[PDB]
Design an enzyme around this catalytic site. Structure first.
Site, PDB file in Angstrom:
ATOM      1  N   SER A 174      11.880  64.202   9.546  1.00  0.00           N
ATOM      2  CA  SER A 174      11.324  63.445  11.201  1.00  0.00           C
ATOM      3  C   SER A 174      11.136  65.013  12.039  1.00  0.00           C
ATOM      4  CB  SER A 174      12.183  62.888  12.273  1.00  0.00           C
ATOM      5  OG  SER A 174      11.664  62.977  13.493  1.00  0.00           O
ATOM      6  N   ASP A 212      16.691  46.582   1.098  1.00  0.00           N
ATOM      7  CA  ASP A 212      18.066  47.707   1.239  1.00  0.00           C
ATOM      8  C   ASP A 212      17.296  49.132   1.008  1.00  0.00           C
ATOM      9  OD1 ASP A 212      19.513  49.434   1.983  1.00  0.00           O
ATOM     10  OD2 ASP A 212      21.611  49.162   0.441  1.00  0.00           O
TER      11      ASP A 212
END
EC number: 3.4.23.22
Length: 330
Positions: free
Chosen positions: A199, A35
């Site tokens: 992004s 994770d």
């Protein structure tokens, strides 16, 4: 040193991925959920409340000659999905894919929430976010990666998750055979303890690319792609009959649909998520309403590039003094 381990989807939907981890001496092999959005290595154990264990493999510290209680240390964690676990702590030898760390904090669960009990395939979590998020008290502990780092050939690990197929986690090297083209690196903020990046935009299907900054985290422990409501609405508007269902808890679409791809930007590069990656199948067994793999982040407080996005790429988690993320097509 290096390590290389195969990671395998737990089910036909790629809801999560499990990676075998050796703990203790002699080794006890547990299948952990790696994770990148948390920082605790915790396991089902001989200490876990018996009614909360249902098919998981457990770690038994008393059977490990290298286990030592980390006296006084406790841990307690709550995840984004509402799940939780807590317990006490041992140090032991932990190996992943041939890479060994001695003295790793292995957080032994005394209690786990129902979602963990109900998932027989996941024996615990191995956190790979920054060690600032580790929950051990009163002495915070390091992740497996942070403990391994100084020994690694390069201070990196990579995630290469498969679509309905096994993939790989590598530690300490970048397998140049595992991706196509070049790797585009992007800046990381560690301010919230995550692999947080920005992004450069998105496209829906064959549509034009929208240049827009989307801050979010690279999180292997989250199944879906959670993005701002504007972006998510723009995606699902291209699917006839798709709608946001408050009863189901997100966007659903007709199982008869063909989904468009979704592209996200990494600098000037682009990662394309095929439409089939976005299909999470019937909302209930036999339903003709299917659950979408792109969902709104608006009720979270962060955008999350979870497995739907990451499995479309080869992803480098660069743990150099200035961390960065890299993405390549594959």
């Amino acid at each position: 040193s290096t390590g290389s381990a195969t990671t395998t989807p737990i089910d036909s939907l790629d809801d999560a991925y499990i990676t075998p981890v050796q703990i203790g001496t002699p080794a006890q092999t547990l299948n952990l959920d790696f994770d990148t959005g948390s920082s605790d290595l915790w396991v089902f154990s001989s200490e876990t409340t018996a009614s909360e264990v249902d098919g998981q493999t457990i770690y038994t510290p008393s059977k490990s000659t290298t286990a030592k209680l980390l006296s006084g240390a406790t841990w307690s964690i709550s995840y984004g999905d509402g799940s939780s676990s807590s317990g006490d702590v041992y140090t032991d030898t932990v190996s992943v894919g041939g890479l060994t760390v001695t003295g790793q904090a292995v957080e032994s669960a005394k209690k786990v929430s129902s979602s963990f009990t109900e998932d027989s395939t996941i024996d615990g979590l191995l956190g790979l976010a920054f060690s600032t998020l580790n929950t051990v008290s009163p002495t915070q502990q390091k992740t497996f990666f942070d403990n391994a780092k100084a020994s690694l050939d390069s201070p990196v690990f990579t995630a290469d998750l498969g679509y309905h197929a096994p993939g790989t986690y590598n530690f300490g090297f970048i397998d140049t055979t595992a991706y196509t083209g070049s790797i585009t690196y992007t800046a990381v903020s560690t301010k919230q303890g995550f692999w947080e990046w920005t992004s450069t935009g998105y496209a829906v299907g064959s549509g034009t690319f929208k240049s827009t900054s989307i801050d979010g985290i690279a999180d292997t422990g989250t199944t879906l792609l959670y993005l701002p409501a504007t972006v998510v609405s723009a995606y699902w508007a291209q699917v006839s009959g798709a709608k946001s269902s408050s009863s189901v808890g997100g966007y659903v679409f007709p199982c008869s649909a063909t989904l468009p791809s979704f592209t996200f930007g990494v600098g000037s590069a682009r990662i394309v998520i095929p439409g089939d990656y976005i299909d999470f199948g019937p909302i209930s067994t036999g339903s003709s309403s299917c659950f979408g793999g792109i969902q709104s982040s608006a009720g979270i407080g962060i955008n999350i590039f979870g497995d739907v996005a990451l499995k479309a790429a080869f992803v480098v988690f660069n743990g150099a003094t200035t961390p960065t993320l890299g993405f390549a097509s594959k």
